[PDB]
Structure formats: structure tokens, C-alpha cells
């Protein structure tokens, strides 16, 4: 039938543009061709050592998760990509800030409809990054971010900890928090909800028709970005608060076993798994 994750969120998005701040992307992958516009934007740090497994692996997969023809959430959504992560998946706070500013400048020059900005990345708590996100949010833009993959309190990371952003943790096919190596999804009061983030099939930049399964809070956040795009296309006048309320209203309630989280984080971590409205 359909991928487990696409079933999990289903008990499209054409009015909305989704900005992706990530690695490079293979914009002619069949899954996203003609749905994604690669902006001239690039701001990345030099690679350290000689590592990566393609330069565009991460972003291509997430673009597919959001808008992909066969495996996407919001199949009518258009996307715009900015490169703020290098070949090893590493960026800078200052590069991210310049990207967020680019988005606002782009909107002012040529306004369209509702904008969703997907930030599938995390660093340490950052006053300036949090402030920039808050600012962009107040300007009328919806920001969705990854909770982080450090099995830690999301409040210690940015943009996860930012006010006015939608922060997304990862759950697996059994609605349980995702383990990633020795770590896993972040948790805590700064996380808004969870979404499918394990074993998620999506566009592989290895070839124009290739697919690969990936895991992470990036993939989880990509789901919510897709869901947000669908909800905003149906109800374009929603304020951020109303959108947040709709995301909570249509979430699966109390399906996560909270024993996975540290004792004190259980009450603080919302037991919600995102889903589309009926």
C-alpha cells in the first residue's frame, strides 16, 4: 500500500511555498522535479577533513518527504531551497541567519501566499538564532524545526528552543521515540509534538528515480512541514496560534510510551503524534 509513515499521519498544499534551509539538493530528481526551485543562495563552512554519502543526500530526501510525487506529504506544495549545510551536513549559525534574512527579503520583493520554513538542523542554544526565528515568525512566517537527535532536552539547542517555532521530535512505526545510534530524538517542554522519523523512505540523490530510507528529527520535522502546508492551503488565513492548535487537535494523543524519556521529562514532553485532518 503506502509507506507506514504516510499511513500514520493519514486518518495538496498548492497555496504554500516551503523554504528548505539545508544541504544542496538534486532538483531534477523525478520525485521533486519542477516542484522545487533552487535559489542562488549558498552560505556554508568549509568541510573538515575529507569525508562524505553525497553532498545533496540529506536535503534531497527531505524535499521528497515534504513534496515528493510518490512518497511526499504535500504533493502539490512548491519548495525553495537554500544551501546552509555543507557536504558533511554542517553549517553555521551566521549562515542560517543570513538564509532566514534572505527568505524575508525574497518575500518583500515578490510576495506570494503562506510561507513555511523548514529548519532540519540544530546547534547549541543560540540567542541570536532564536531571536531571528522569533522575528521571522512575527513577520507572519511559519517555522518548523527538528528537535535534535541528541536524546536530550530540546531547550538546550537552537532553533529547537526558539519561541514561535514548531519543534518536532521523532517517533517510529510503533509510535515510540526514535533511537539513533547511542542517542535519539530530543524531548522536553520545547518540543511541540512528534512525527514519523524512523525508517522514512524518500528521494535518494544517488539517481533520478532512486529512493532510500532515512531516520532523524529532520525527517519528522519534514512531515510536519508537509502537514502545515496542507492545513495552510485549506485554511490560508490561519494565524500561527490557530495552526498550532489545529496540529494539536488532529494529533494522535497519548500513544507514546513515556518511560523512554527521563523521569522528570515525561510530564514536560507532549504526548502527541502529528496527523492530517480527516
Amino acid at each position: 500500500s503506502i509507506p507506514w509513515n504516510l499511513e500514520r499521519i493519514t486518518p495538496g498544499g498548492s497555496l504554500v511555498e516551503v523554504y528548505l534551509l539545508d544541504t544542496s539538493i538534486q532538483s531534477d530528481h523525478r520525485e521533486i522535479e519542477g516542484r522545487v526551485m533552487v535559489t542562488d543562495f549558498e552560505n556554508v563552512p568549509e568541510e573538515d577533513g575529507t569525508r562524505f554519502s553525497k553532498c545533496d543526500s540529506h536535503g534531497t530526501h527531505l524535499a521528497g518527504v515534504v513534496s515528493g510525487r510518490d512518497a511526499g506529504v504535500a504533493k502539490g506544495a512548491s519548495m525553495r531551497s537554500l544551501r546552509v549545510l555543507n557536504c558533511q551536513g554542517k553549517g553555521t549559525v551566521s549562515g542560517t541567519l543570513i538564509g532566514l534574512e534572505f527568505i524575508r527579503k525574497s518575500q518583500l520583493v515578490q510576495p506570494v501566499g503562506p510561507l513555511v520554513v523548514l529548519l532540519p538542523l540544530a546547534g547549541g542554544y543560540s540567542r541570536v538564532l532564536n531571536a531571528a526565528c522569533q522575528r521571522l515568525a512575527r513577520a507572519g512566517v511559519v517555522l518548523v524545526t527538528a528537535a535534535g537527535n541528541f536524546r536530550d532536552d530540546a531547550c538546550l539547542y537552537s532553533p529547537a528552543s526558539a519561541p514561535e517555532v514548531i519543534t518536532v521530535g521523532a517517533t517510529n512505526a510503533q509510535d515510540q521515540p526514535v533511537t539513533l545510534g547511542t542517542l535519539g530524538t530530543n524531548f522536553g517542554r520545547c518540543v511541540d509534538l512528534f512525527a514519523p522519523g524512523e525508517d522514512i523512505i524518500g528521494a535518494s540523490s544517488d539517481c533520478s528515480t532512486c529512493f532510500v530510507s532515512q531516520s532523524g528529527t529532520s525527517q519528522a520535522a519534514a512531515h510536519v512541514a508537509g502537514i502545515a502546508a496542507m492545513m495552510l492551503s485549506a485554511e490560508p488565513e490561519l494565524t500561527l496560534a490557530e495552526l498550532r492548535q489545529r496540529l494539536i487537535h488532529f494529533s494522535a494523543k497519548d500513544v507514546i510510551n513515556e518511560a523512554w524519556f527521563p523521569e522528570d521529562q515525561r510530564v514536560l514532553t507532549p504526548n502527541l503524534v502529528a496527523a492530517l485532518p480527516p
Partner: peptide, 13 residues
Amino acid sequence: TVFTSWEEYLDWV
């Protein structure tokens, strides 16, 4: 595993 087509993925899953 990288699947070379959506059909390939469908056959496997």
C-alpha cells in the same frame, strides 16, 4: 538499501 525505482521499493516493502 537504495531502490532504483518506486516500483522496486514497492516490490520490496
